[PDB]
Amino acid sequence: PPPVRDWPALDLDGPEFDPVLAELMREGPLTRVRLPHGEGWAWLATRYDDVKAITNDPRFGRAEVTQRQITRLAPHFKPRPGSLAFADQPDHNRLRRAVAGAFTVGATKRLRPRAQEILDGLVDGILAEGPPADLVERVLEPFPIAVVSEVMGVPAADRERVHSWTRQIISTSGGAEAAERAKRGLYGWITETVRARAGSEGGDVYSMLGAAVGRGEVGETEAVGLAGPLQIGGEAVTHNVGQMLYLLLTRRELMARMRERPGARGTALDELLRWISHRTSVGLARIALEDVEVHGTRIAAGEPVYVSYLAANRDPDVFPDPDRIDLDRDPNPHLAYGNGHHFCTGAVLARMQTELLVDTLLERLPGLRLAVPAEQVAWRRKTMIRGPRTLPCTWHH
């Protein structure tokens, strides 16, 4: 076989695709890579089809991954009971069942209005204070959160604790014991919550869950593990949209389109979604459960495999001229939200927040543009999700 490759945790200063990934891509359909932490190496599927296929083969377990030392990108690794991330059917299915209702298309169409109201207040502020403002800390961050806390079902008196605790995201890292108590707060509060809310209607996520624990269908010890991620999830929109904006704000050709013909931002937003390198490397792996012949290659049982949707999204077979941003692509079946029964639970809710951000920010912030040079925007370092550290923008006042 081909020699194992080292895939360091490099910090690109920009939206730049990962070069080493680019390399592994042209090295063959499958490659062996060694990540920063954890022992051994791991398989890597770069081709669209193999990826979609690998992510949909029942023969790949994700639970076993909680018990091994798979070569990983993160320093620490502590999976928690209830987490969908390591859920395996029938488990997974049982769990998502308890919260899925809140993220449905019908569930999100009903929120748009209340989420628009939210965003509007936020815009009301920067508009009123004046142009020199950081869209990242004034809109893009407190917004996905608030909207999610709405779906989650955080009360109105709790509306300020929860937000204030959702500082696990931070600018970068508040500190080792910093976001520690914070994550220890939200999670505590959540148990407290779920414990009450037992036996109660309301599509409210904490209600459904807490009622499910009532019926023991997802009983505690799984609660703060299932809702945990869903609560903190807004974080992704805060960085992905931060990037959509960054490209729009540094590539006049894109902003032109985005503006010269709104109500057409639909495919454009899909293009950005596909093209953007959302995370810094590869996420959680999947363990091969019984010797699979992935793209003419005997992957033995017990062996771990990863998938790079990022690279998958660049497959020339599927996306002609993959590296060019187009904004006007055909059906463009990208995979930013994942695939298989581990597809993004918030994809639909995320899109809605994305469609509000771009539309609303481009609308109320007339002639929106960077307030500093492009070289002035810094990027998050050493973290799963890639993104601008801030965004100083200005607008006609």
Residues lying near a second copy in the complex (CB under 8 A): 37-40, 67-69, 124-125, 128-130, 132, 160-161, 164-165, 167, 174-175, 177-178, 180-182, 184-185, 302
End-to-end, the C-alpha distance of the chain in Å comes to: 62
Q: How many residues bind ligand HEM (CB under 6 A)?
A: 27
Nearest residue (CB) to ligand HEM, 81 versus 229: 229
Site string for ligand HEM, 139-178 (x = CB under 6 A): ---------x------------------------------
- In the complex, least distance from residue 231 CB atom to ligand HEM, rounded to whole angstroms: 7
Nearest residue (CB) to a second copy, 127 versus 348: 127
Does position 85 interact with ligand HEM (CB under 6 A)? The reply is: yes
Does position 240 interact with ligand HEM (CB under 6 A)? The reply is: yes
By C-alpha distance, which of 179, 338, 226 is closest to 273?
338
- In the complex, least distance from residue 101 CB atom to ligand HEM, rounded to whole angstroms: 13
Does position 101 interact with ligand HEM (CB under 6 A)? The reply is: no
Residues pairing with 32 in the sheet: 43
Q: Is 279 annotated as a binding residue?
A: yes
Q: Is 393 annotated as a binding residue?
A: no
Q: Which of residues 41-60 bind ligand HEM (CB under 6 A)?
A: 55
By a kind-dependent CB cut-off of 5 to 8 A, residue 37 interacts, out of a second copy, ligand HEM, none, with a second copy
Q: Which of 225, 283, 304, 387 is close enough to bind ligand HEM by CB under 6 A?
A: 283
Nearest residue (CB) to a second copy, 79 versus 338: 79
By C-alpha distance, which of 298, 297, 302, 282 is closest to 69?
302
Q: Which of residues 316-355 bind ligand HEM (CB under 6 A)?
A: 336-339, 341-342, 344-346, 349-350, 354
By a kind-dependent CB cut-off of 5 to 8 A, residue 214 interacts, out of a second copy, ligand HEM, none, with none
- In the complex, least distance from residue 128 CB atom to a second copy, rounded to whole angstroms: 5
Closest residue to bound ligand HEM by CB: 233
Does position 82 interact with ligand HEM (CB under 6 A)? The reply is: no
- In the complex, least distance from residue 301 CB atom to a second copy, rounded to whole angstroms: 9
- In the complex, least distance from residue 278 CB atom to ligand HEM, rounded to whole angstroms: 5
User: Which residues, 6+ apart, have CB-to-CB distance to 142 below 8 Å?
Assistant: 122, 163
Nearest residue (CB) to ligand HEM, 29 versus 79: 79
Q: Is 342 annotated as a binding residue?
A: no
Dist CA 274 CA 335 (whole Å): 7
By a kind-dependent CB cut-off of 5 to 8 A, residue 174 interacts, out of ligand HEM, a second copy, none, with a second copy
By C-alpha distance, which of 216, 217, 78, 229 is closest to 148?
229
Contact 238, 141 (CB under 8 A): yes
Tell me the binding residues: 80, 187, 278-279, 344
Annotated binding site for heme: 344
Which segments are annotated as binding site for flaviolin?
80, 187, 278-279
Task: Give contact residues for ligand HEM (rule: CB under 6 A).
Answer: 55, 84-85, 148, 229-230, 233-234, 236-237, 240, 278, 283-284, 309, 336-339, 341-342, 344-346, 349-350, 354
